[PDB]
């Protein structure tokens, strides 16, 4: 006789094989794939002819809402209905449903395509003890540049067109993570500063090179409401502006590479 033999050529291991698959598909479809839908759902459609009710399917695919209670007050519940009311300066290139849209105006200023930001909260991200998290070193006075690294303050910023666009006057540090996230520059011949995320900066000994946008386009980098603070949505606006340059800084950037 055999250990594990159940009968017909049923044996224990054979049954556990089925159970194993079942457990995996259950967790994957009924749990994980519904956790995947806590943002962006329900899917939207141009000009829904009529919907007296959401499809049953739109109810079935969603998890029950969860509520985060935020560290500095308030709550957030997901999923939740978040239409984007904001007008998009885009036009259909064709009537076909999967056709690409295209900017009717200045995509960088209009914030469309790779220049889009998200509707983040207009709140200043905070440290664990309640202070503004991302602040200029003019303010974060006990923070410094590590010995060995370029101090960019004073250095020219050179834009994609090789033209100098301004002068770095400060660095903004993440006081929660001890990590620089933006440079601030005086924009040449304008009377404004602009932040630029450090990821768009090639930091050299004698200059900061920025290939995402041309010198002219620094004029229109999003402006902050305060000089020494920045909100989560502003961070999105500023970052997105340069990202948009990667596709839109010149006419030829959107066309085929090769």
């Amino acid at each position: 006789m055999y250990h594990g033999a159940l009968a017909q050529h049923l044996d224990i291991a054979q049954l556990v094989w089925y159970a194993q698959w079942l457990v995996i598909w259950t967790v994957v479809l009924l749990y994980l794939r519904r956790e995947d839908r806590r943002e962006g759902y329900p899917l939207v459609e141009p000009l829904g002819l009529v919907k007296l009710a959401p499809e049953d399917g739109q109810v079935y695919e969603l998890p029950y809402p969860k509520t985060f209670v935020l560290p500095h007050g308030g709550t957030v519940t997901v999923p939740r209905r978040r239409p984007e009311t904001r007008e998009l300066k885009l036009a259909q290139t064709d009537g076909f449903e999967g056709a690409p849209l295209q900017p009717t105006g200045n995509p960088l200023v209009d914030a469309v395509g790779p220049a889009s930001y998200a509707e983040r909260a207009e709140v200043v991200d905070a440290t664990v003890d309640g202070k503004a998290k991302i602040v200029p070193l003019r303010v974060a006075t006990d923070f410094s540049i590590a010995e060995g690294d370029v101090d960019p303050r004073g250095l020219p910023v050179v834009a994609a067109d090789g033209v100098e666009a301004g002068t770095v006057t400060d660095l903004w540090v993440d006081r929660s993570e001890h990590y620089f996230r933006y440079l601030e520059l005086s924009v040449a011949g304008s009377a404004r500063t602009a932040l630029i995320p450090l990821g768009f900066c090639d930091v050299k000994k004698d200059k900061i090179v920025v290939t995402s946008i041309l010198s002219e386009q620094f004029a229109n980098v999003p402006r902050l409401q305060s000089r020494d603070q920045i909100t989560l949505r502003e961070e999105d606006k500023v970052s997105a502006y340069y990202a948009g340059g990667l596709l839109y800084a010149t006419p030829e950037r959107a066309e085929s590479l090769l």
Binding site: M1, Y2, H3, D11
Partner: protein, 332 residues
């Protein structure tokens, strides 16, 4: 520590199974050259006269040979075993029937053993056969022999370092490792498997589910048996200068039929042949050998696969003298 391409590869299984030999051409060449030193057959002589059973005084094994034939054998033997020492290695030069020197009596036993291999172990040696040279390679002490503990260097013509010396306890793990293709397997497959027929090499179950009655507690073989078998198989591989897929489809090591090559069955017979030689011919020689020949347990040196094969899948790349020296078997 690397070997430059090209590699010589063969196929020993259905395409896409990655079965076959992987050989470094320079190593094969070096072995071919070593093995090419096999002396050629002495010229044939005409069988004239009485059997030396009449002619000579103390001929026990080869008595049916004529004088010319017999002296040809003695000349061949001297060349294979004791070329540097000459006839007197075994003979009193004033009495050729004298059994006074131990190599004489050992040699008589070796004529019997050799005729036994060629007559009774054709399953293994087929029509290639063995001569004294296959093991001895021109010295009285064969280069690759085994005691009841692992010894180093494998080739005893090489001089041991102090750590290699069997007395040096701290060198034990390396003496074992170099017998099992450098693995760390903590088992000596010679004394476990090849010195006698006490142990079963097969460890893998032949049923899908565990049979009630052999599958729990002390009913079970210890897992150590599976290590030991792997150790034997590392050793067999290194001894023949080959890899597992020369014999097995690793899909199922325990299966035969399509899952095993013809060489695996020849290897099975080799295990039985080696055990016979050891139990019945070589181990008893400790009664006849000087103490200087014996191991630390009073064991005579005995044989494993390497004793003949010396790193080649066929000893001496399949060279044969079987037709040249019928005296040595097969004996009808």
């Amino acid at each position: 520590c690397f070997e430059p391409p090209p590699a010589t590869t063969t196929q020993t299984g259905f395409r896409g199974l990655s079965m076959g030999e992987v050989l470094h051409p320079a190593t094969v060449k070096a072995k071919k050259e070593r093995d090419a030193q096999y002396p050629p057959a002495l010229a044939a002589v005409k069988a004239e006269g009485p059997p030396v059973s009449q002619v000579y005084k103390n001929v026990k094994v080869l008595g049916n040979l004529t004088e010319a034939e017999f002296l040809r054998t003695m000349t061949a033997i001297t060349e294979w075993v004791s070329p540097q020492e000459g006839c007197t290695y075994c003979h009193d030069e004033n009495n050729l029937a004298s059994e006074a020197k131990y190599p004489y009596v050992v040699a008589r036993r070796m004529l019997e053993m050799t005729r036994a291999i060629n007559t009774n172990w054709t399953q293994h040696v087929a029509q290639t056969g063995v001569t004294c040279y296959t093991c001895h390679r021109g010295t009285p002490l064969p280069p690759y022999v085994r005691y009841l503990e692992p010894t180093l260097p494998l080739n005893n013509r090489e001089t041991p370092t102090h750590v290699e010396r069997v007395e040096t306890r701290s060198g034990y793990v390396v003496r074992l490792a170099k017998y099992t293709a450098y693995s760390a397997l903590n088992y000596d497959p010679f004394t476990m498997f090849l010195a006698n027929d006490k142990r079963q090499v097969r460890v893998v179950p032949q049923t899908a589910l565990p049979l009630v009655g052999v599958s729990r507690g002390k009913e079970r073989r210890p897992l150590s048996d599976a290590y030991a078998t792997f150790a034997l198989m590392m050793s067999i591989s290194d001894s023949l200068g080959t890899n597992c897929t020369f014999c097995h489809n690793a899909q199922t090591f325990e299966s035969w039929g399509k899952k095993s090559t013809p060489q695996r069955a020849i290897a099975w017979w080799g295990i039985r042949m080696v055990r016979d030689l050891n139990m019945n011919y070589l181990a008893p020689l400790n009664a006849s050998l000087p103490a200087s020949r014996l191991g630390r347990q009073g064991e005579a040196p005995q044989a494993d696969c390497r004793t003949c094969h010396q790193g080649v899948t066929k000893p001496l790349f399949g060279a044969s003298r079987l037709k040249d020296y019928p005296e040595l078997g097969p004996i009808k």
